[PDB]
Design a protein around this ligand. Structure first.
Ligand code: NAI
Ligand code: FNR
Ligand code: SF4
Ligand code: FES
Ligand code: NA
Ligand code: NA
Ligand code: NA
Ligand code: NA
Lengths: 418, 156
């Protein structure tokens, strides 16, 4: 019925798959979804063996769209190797800076996600699945709750779905402010009603996850691909983009571009094409200084000709593209990244706890011109020493982007040392 | 002594009955309470703990961990303002200055009447529409002071 206000993010697709409907900024309910063949991939999946579904998802070469790019099929195979019961979790925590790709699927085409969740749950033998959506996506929460009910009413959820003997309930959990709850093990801890504290891995969730049982965690965008793989078949899916890195990919583009929004593009597209061919170029036609890949990586204007794929020389990550131009202060920008990690460390690991804090504190001094010589040397040290003993990816990367700015824009940093 | 009103207790019971295990409802319950009171009353945690079958200590630790919850200031409307990289580049400071012009308060502060609190938050996942803000559950791009003034006038 009535939902909270959501800004209308611009969305454009060359492939017309994930954004076939979500390119229009409004909720698409179940009847609209059904008209385009919605839920027919599910019906087809329920007439396949779980094993065959895994095979197809494997041969599609689908990789995790959450940012790490782990092969989805392999992840599923690993889970099914372990005794049940098993759980399936849709990761809708999306809290990386610059990252807003998953919410347009949630808010505009929820049945694409739900259909994927049901197929995926069936494939791994899970009778209980979860969406964990960040607390700052309230509209998404209510839109998902209503869509699940719609799906129930049409017999796509519940006991004995379409006579298949497969049972599934999808529960919707909400976050309450912690970026770390998007880390899959901390998400699980949060689902168990605890603080969002990551666990030592291995074990990976597919071995021990929710209540210690085999648990697959996949990202919203990953799961949104599953309908298509079953629908078109894996061969036809792999014909999209480069054969090595196949399928559609969503690219949330922000900062100093004429046309900020989400672009659905193949992964052979270059970073330069994302910015200039699709996003309309830079505001004021100014020169690109850097692109921040969320809070993970910083690319210079000499690295724009890279593919937006999961290859070694590729952009990788979530596909998040934050554009800075020639008048943007890289130290000011780095401070904002330091501030992020300061606010999100969970504090379990000592170098992460102290390192994230000190990196921000000292960088602020540097930026404000109040840093002693010791503060400077200390900043450098701390930046290189957040990772040690860390048990999750936050600690491992919290200095990464900033270090990249130090190496790629030394002239600008040296000015701050003056 | 402290007891939930029945309309609120009923809603909390729904959340508690929703997941397979009661303790899974903790965050939904805490959102509900904050929505109802304008903040998390300290005295609410003990009875919440009992409905969840969790120790009070557990509930307190959870409230302290999750940044959306506020045990200090009652506010009818929370204006969450994004202060992360993209909004900062595209004009967080203009939004904040416009807010101070209209409401006479800065981040962390509450208007004298208890109506509006400004809450600096990390990336809200709407970066293309920077600078972004929320008023409770409603989310918007900031365009100008005049535009902001009109939006805020919708919250009485
Ligand atoms: N979308 C967003 O809002 C955010 C995304 N991220 C992304 O998070 C990424 C890091 O995530 P991680 O989970 O630490 O990465 P990872 O590389 O450790 O693991 C990726 C996935 O593969 C699974 N996996 C890996 N090796 C496995 C094995 N041997 N057996 C079974 N399963 C295995 C993991 O369980 C996980 O589900 C970063 O690249 C970043 O881009 C980070 C923050 C926010
Ligand atoms: C600190 C931090 C925060 C997040 C993550 C990692 C870390 C280190 N991950 C990645 C997550 O742990 C996991 O890799 C994916 O959810 C697995 O799904 P895919 O294989 O990408 O489909 C993650 N993934 C996601 O889907 N949404 C999110 O918001 C986050 N947040
Ligand atoms: S590395 Fe940092 S965020 Fe990750 S578990 Fe350790 S303290 Fe928490
Ligand atoms: S940086 Fe403000 S919404 Fe992302
Ligand atoms: Na349609
Ligand atoms: Na969260
Ligand atoms: Na991992
Ligand atoms: Na004014």
């Amino acid at each position: 019925r009535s939902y909270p206000a959501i800004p209308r993010i611009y969305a454009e697709t060359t492939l017309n798959m994930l954004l076939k409907r979500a390119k229009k900024p409004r909720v698409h309910s179940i009847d609209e979804y059904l008209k385009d063949g919605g839920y027919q991939a599910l019906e087809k999946a329920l007439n396949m063996s779980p094993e065959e579904i895994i095979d197809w998802v494997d041969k599609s070469t689908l990789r995790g769209r959450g940012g790490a790019g782990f092969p989805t099929g392999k992840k599923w195979k690993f889970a099914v190797q372990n005794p049940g019961p098993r759980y399936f979790i849709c990761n809708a925590d999306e809290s990386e800076p610059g990252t807003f790709k998953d919410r347009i699927i949630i808010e505009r085409d929820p049945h694409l996600l739900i259909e994927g969740i049901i197929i995926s749950s069936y494939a791994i033998g899970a009778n209980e699945a979860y969406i964990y959506i960040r607390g700052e996506y309230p509209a998404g929460y209510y839109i998902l709750r209503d869509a699940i009910e719609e799906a129930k009413k049409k017999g796509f959820l519940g006991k004995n779905i379409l006579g298949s003997g497969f049972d599934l309930e999808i529960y919707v959990a909400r976050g309450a402010g912690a970026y770390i709850c998007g880390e899959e093990t901390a998400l699980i801890e949060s689902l168990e009603g605890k603080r969002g504290h990551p666990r030592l891995k291995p074990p990976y969730p597919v071995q021990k996850g929710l209540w210690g049982k085999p648990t697959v965690v996949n990202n919203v965008e990953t799961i949104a691909n599953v309908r298509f793989i079953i629908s078109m078949g894996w061969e036809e899916y792999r014909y999209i983009g480069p054969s090595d890195y196949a399928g559609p990919k969503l690219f949330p583009v922000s900062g100093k571009v004429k046309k900020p929004g989400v672009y659905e593009l193949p992964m052979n597209t270059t970073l330069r094409e994302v910015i200039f061919k699709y996003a309309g170029g830079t505001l004021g036609n100014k020169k690109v200084k850097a692109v921040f890949s969320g809070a993970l990586d910083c690319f210079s204007s000499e690295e724009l000709d890279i593919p937006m794929d999961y290859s070694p020389l590729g952009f990788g990550g979530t596909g998040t593209v934050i554009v800075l131009t020639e008048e943007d202060d890289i130290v000011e920008a780095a401070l904002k990244i330091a501030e992020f990690y300061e606010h999100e460390t969970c504090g379990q690991c000592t170098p992460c706890r102290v390192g994230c804090y000190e990196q921000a504190n000292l960088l602020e001094k540097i930026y404000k011109g109040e840093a002693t010589e010791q503060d400077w040397e200390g900043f450098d040290f701390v930046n290189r020493n957040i990772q040690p003993t860390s048990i999750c990816g936050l600690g491992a990367v919290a200095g990464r982007l900033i270090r990249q700015t130090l190496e790629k824009f030394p002239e600008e940093w040296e000015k701050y040392r003056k | 002594e402290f007891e939930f009103p029945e309309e609120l207790k009923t809603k909390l019971q729904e959340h508690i009955n929703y997941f397979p295990k009661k303790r899974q409802a903790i965050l939904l319950c805490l959102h509900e309470i904050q929505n109802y009171y304008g903040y998390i009353p300290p005295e609410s945690l003990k009875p919440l703990a009992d409905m969840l079958e969790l120790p009070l200590n557990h509930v307190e630790g959870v409230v302290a961990f999750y940044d959306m919850f506020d045990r200090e200031d009652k506010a009818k409307y929370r204006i969450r303002v994004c202060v992360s990289i993209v909004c900062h580049l595209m004009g967080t400071n203009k939004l904040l200055k416009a807010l101070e012009n209209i409401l006479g308060i800065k981040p962390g502060e509450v208007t004298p009447d208890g109506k509006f609190k400004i809450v600096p938050v990390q990336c809200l996942g709407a970066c293309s529409e920077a600078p972004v803000f929320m008023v409770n559950d409603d989310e918007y791009k900031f365009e100008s002071e005049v535009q902001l003034n009109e939006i805020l006038s919708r919250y009485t």
